[PDB]
Design a binder for this molecule. Structure first.
Ligand SMILES: N[C@@H](CCCC[NH3+])C(=O)O
Ligand SMILES: N[C@@H](CCCC[NH3+])C(=O)O
Ligand SMILES: N[C@@H](CCCC[NH3+])C(=O)O
Ligand SMILES: N[C@@H](CCCC[NH3+])C(=O)O
Ligand SMILES: N[C@@H](CCCC[NH3+])C(=O)O
Ligand SMILES: N[C@@H](CCCC[NH3+])C(=O)O
Ligand SMILES: [Mn+2]
Ligand SMILES: [Mn+2]
Ligand SMILES: [Mn+2]
Ligand SMILES: [Mn+2]
Ligand SMILES: [Mn+2]
Ligand SMILES: [Mn+2]
Ligand SMILES: [Mn+2]
Ligand SMILES: [Mn+2]
Ligand SMILES: [Mn+2]
Ligand SMILES: [Mn+2]
Ligand SMILES: [Mn+2]
Ligand SMILES: [Mn+2]
Lengths: 273, 273, 273, 273, 273, 273
């Protein structure tokens, strides 16, 4: 019944993502859906910038852990790095499954690689990476993580993912199996666990979502993304959500932000029938 | 072997739809397919406009009912309201299955809703709605009706559809099951019955068919629409067809009209092999 | 030019009907008439027996549907129940008119009645009755059905027939109008449609055709039956035929089977001049 | 989400009530509350005047009955007589509970009494009174009616009310039990039913609402009226509302109209917290 | 249309339950209802007996999973322990709602308690209990389970039920709310899911069903039990059924078995009107 | 103030019902209630027996029609067939509502069915059935009839009841709505009309009233039956009553007759407070 929205304008043009999502009327539409919604505003944001990222993500983690239970958090973001804080915070010390819907795996470590932290959050959350990050953000077991829509990986990432035993559904599996079957398998693999969904806008085909920093051709269609959100919603186990990497500076008429808002609605129960 | 084409330029810019469809060479192409074709011209068209709609639809019903049996009728339209007359007329007092391919259910009543009659034809045909319409247009049992491609419904419509027991395949089912399976299920549900296909241009994704009054994203692809028509055609039970809601004023290079003409050809037997 | 004969020795002594008909030289006489004939042998036959009947009729339906078009099928039978499969199969998914020449209407449902399925085939074909049957055998529309020679009906049957709007020519109409006029009206009522003739031996007066399970006095004379067949033949629209209910165990010198073979020859063009 | 406002400037100076209510910014404030509002304008108004009243109320009934379901109607009025049409029209043929908040019971018949029709609407609605009125306005069972705030009754009225079994909460009961308890009892007595609230401005103490034709001392306080509206709103069952008897000619700075507009907002969800 | 009946004479005198139920003409009456029925015979049955129970339940699970889809399975039993296999098998790997109509919750684990396995099946099915059982029988999410008619619970059970979040309707709720409302709430709570109904004879008042191992006073009346079955039947979502714990050795004239057969008929569509 | 009791010992062991009812001191208790009572004795009684039934019922009709108005008639019976005469006679040519409290609908016609006339009285009274009966006993419009407590119907009866538009409250509705609400709805449905109550002993659960020819489990409880009678009594519109189908030969200590006598007392005003 209750939903809390918090923004993380972190870009360490994605820092404009939270405003774009708000402008796509995420809040008004959540209310039309029957939810009572509260906008918590934005979390202050001031190798590269590791400490600054740590500081911001820490505020986020603490902000989410404070929420009275029963309040569904939706984090609007810039960098996917914010997920280190959102997942750790939203998990509330309990075992949660993570469904990472992204064109990338974000499973790099300082060792595997351009040194961008927003390319290592899922690894950090899994307990792999720089100590200053894992010490406060490790929050999920690699076996309780599922990647969906992946189509671009670094050599080092591939190794780590395999070593860690993370279930990965690349676009190859999406094409081969279909979203309906994959969604079912995702729920089975993470059965009995509350689920945190982290949705990176770049999972959508670039033709549909141009407003992303690292576009990769051959992504999910509008319909597949909605189906995935609908099936995950049906499970009734989704407890939190990240809407990240929206970059209005590369977008067209804010359609990428509008896309993600529509997907959030589907994930929270909006149905045709 | 025989096909009769009649237009209903009713908009009570869709009134330009019949001309657009004729300009897309529906007639010439039906002949290339081996059918002998006759253009019957247009039916005269002069809450909102209920009596005027009733009058026009009545002329249409009578015109179709008077056709010699064995002559396949294709009604070109503006408003989907014309289907009250086309289905009642093409049914010939007989039990017919109705396959409504539309982004909407057109199952509203004066009570459920903007008062537009073109949003109530399927309800009327099923015997629900204003007495002045149901008294002369009721023509199908709700159980012999199947909706395909629906992605937008009003609250009242949902209730009526469930109460009536109408089989509904929304885009969610389309994504989940696939058109092939849905087409098979349609034929099974309406097994042994002649079939009337009512095709609303808006069932197609807006990116593919922009020339429609009420576009709704996430529609059928070009291929899916043809596959549906081809499987229905294989049954050999299709007996009549409506090609409605084409709006050239909102279209681009008449591509929406061309889309529907191609779909009509597939429904009438055109095959790749 | 081509005729295919198939037997259905179903009695769920009419199971001996196919052999009796073959022994009456149906095949040799069809050849003398100029047809190239192929005997397909018999379809395997193993409330009462509904599933067994469904199985056998389904094999029949598939066998007929698989025939190359242009091949006239003649089904020899025991129970008239086989018509659920012969009509559905011979229809080939297209609209066909049914001329049911029988002393009975076979229009009962499980509700209207002794529970014998061979008393419900026409109702099933018309979409009325047990779901397990109508779901695979519904194949004709009530207004495309004409009963000729009826002289015995159950109370429930009368209701269903009137509700369904089936054109019925009982012996009262035969006596009042004459076969010539009735045949003309049958063709008019089913104008433009290919015709399936289902001939039950009991339509003939018992004095002429004793070999039937449920004889009813006051039936058609030898000449009337031949006149009906000859006029239907002249239309050039007859596409399939059932020769059912021949029971050699109750017959005299196989004359009933010989009667039906003679009528089949008239239906297929045999003429005095 | 949707609200429709219609006025009935009937005084057969209360005819100036609709304008006064509109000038109190009822519409603008409903929008600030989040509702989408449509002003339908006024219904034409031309023993005493029974036929003229009937005509106007009939137009009103039809106008409300034609509204798409889901649209909350608020009728602005002069005479409370308009309620014969508003309740009958807003009921939509279904069983509805009526909460009549008035200093009077308006339960007179031509027999019980000054012949003013605006003193008989509730009786008429309950099926008691002149045939010309009950024949088209009877719309509620006396047992689904609850009067709140009554402090002035005619001898005849008392008899009819008791005979009919109408639940009446006079100011004596208000003083004794308190509005909170009375509001709870009202919802219980009319449990499971959609509610129509008819608010007569004279239910409020004259010192607070001087702009009324028949002021009666000892009415509801500002706070009690708002509490009643808030508790009724919490039920989520209120479907329609009448704001009647506002007379600007006897008012002071339009405060009575402003009072009612404030109460309408409370009834529609406005809350301090 | 199709029903398969299988018995599990497990008592590890309830082992005589399957014969008692068959003697109550379950099969003959299902056919009178219009279903085609097949008796699959019985599944071989040879802390306490955990492995033997596991073996039998496994055979049952496989037998049901192997059934062609569309075939409604009814499992006749001795011990309710058989449900570990019937539910897992009937679920067919898909998400199913479970309606457990029992005087007990059968939600014990080896830890919570007399060590009887037939007092732990629902817990096992929910994934709680001995590993040897949960590894092959876990098949439902605690949130998709609803208990109806409970009137006897162990301290440990109460904890587990609350921890798991299982919706429980004890006889207190039944008395307070009424079966009509409870049935509605059950369907809502398990909306959109196929339903498996597990009916324990002891849910019925002992005065009505004496033939049960653990009778508990204050149970459901004959009418309440039929109403529950009728409302669940109306949903059209019931896909499987268990009829367990019938003990003819403690019964009177087999009335408990006859009671359950009647309830099965109501659940499968039998209605007064 | 005045009550007339007449018996109809018709069984064409229910013929012993009138004596059983008298022995239950119906008369003495009616006097204790304040009524002046007169026993008119019994009406002479000499497909099946249609003419004999007609003759007896006719004598009954004439006997009741001849009673001075203001005298409440109570007819004690054997067969419910007597109601053809009691209702027609008690109606006195005026429009009366009929409350048929029975486990059966008695709405059969010679066509719908074992040919027992006592299974067709309500139909006859409604103008459906054998001409010999309807010509002299038709006396009520199907729309002024309400059945309460029904739990057993023949297929044909269902059709006739729906066709005729008779309001039917089966035990399913009783369980769902409760007698209180049903009694209110009965009075509303028959508002403004004098009421004739026909009470068949078999409406009561067999466990409570074993003395009936066709017992059907799941009937009304003692309290429900008294509540129904008390609410009908409160209306003050009940004008006549039949107490039928009491069979002392199948009864236990005349408790069924005592049950009905008690119910008559409640119907005639006996109250606890
Ligand atoms: N509309 C936002 C711009 C996004 C800024 C994020 N820091 C603001 O101007 O407040
Ligand atoms: N070419 C057609 C145009 C279709 C018009 C819509 N009422 C004409 O104007 O004759
Ligand atoms: N001539 C066949 C007899 C068919 C009668 C029924 N199955 C045979 O005996 O081989
Ligand atoms: N303001 C209104 C006056 C109240 C009218 C009521 N009929 C007008 O001048 O339109
Ligand atoms: N009639 C059953 C008896 C059920 C006893 C429990 N195993 C049998 O086949 O012997
Ligand atoms: N005691 C009554 C008995 C009624 C049985 C019905 N004809 C008598 O012999 O007069
Ligand atoms: Mn990412
Ligand atoms: Mn990414
Ligand atoms: Mn449409
Ligand atoms: Mn549309
Ligand atoms: Mn026949
Ligand atoms: Mn026959
Ligand atoms: Mn008033
Ligand atoms: Mn007043
Ligand atoms: Mn149990
Ligand atoms: Mn139990
Ligand atoms: Mn009766
Ligand atoms: Mn009865």
């Amino acid at each position: 019944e209750r939903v809390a929205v918090v923004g993380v304008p972190m870009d360490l043009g994605v820092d404009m993502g939270p405003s774009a999502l708000r402008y796509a009327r995420l809040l008004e539409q959540l209310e039309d859906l029957g939810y009572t919604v509260e906008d918590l505003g934005d979390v202050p944001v001031s190798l590269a910038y590791l400490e600054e990222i740590r500081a911001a993500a820490l505020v986020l983690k603490e902000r989410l852990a404070a929420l009275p239970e029963g309040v569904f958090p939706i984090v609007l973001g810039g960098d996917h790095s914010l997920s280190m804080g959102s997942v750790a915070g939203a998990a509330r010390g309990r075992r949660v499954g993570v469904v990472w819907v992204d064109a990338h795996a974000d499973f790099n470590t300082p060792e595997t690689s351009s040194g961008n932290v927003h390319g290592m959050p899922l690894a950090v959350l899994s307990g792999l990476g720089h100590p200053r990050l894992t010490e406060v953000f490790r929050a999920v077991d690699p076996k309780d993580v599922v990647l969906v829509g992946v189509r671009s990986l670094d050599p080092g990432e591939k190794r780590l993912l395999k070593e860690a035993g993370v279930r990965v559904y690349t676009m190859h599996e999406v094409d081969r199996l279909g979203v309906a079957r994959i969604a079912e398998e995702v729920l089975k693999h993470l059965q009995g666990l509350p689920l945190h969904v982290s949705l990176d806008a770049d999972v959508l085909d670039p033709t549909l979502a141009p407003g992303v920093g690292t576009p990769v051709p051959g992504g999910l269609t509008y319909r597949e993304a909605h189906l995935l959100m609908e099936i995950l919603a049906e499970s009734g186990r989704v407890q939190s959500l990240d809407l990240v990497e929206v970059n209005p500076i590369l977008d067209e008429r804010n359609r990428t932000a509008e896309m993600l808002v529509g997907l959030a609605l589907s994930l929270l129960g909006k149905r045709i029938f």
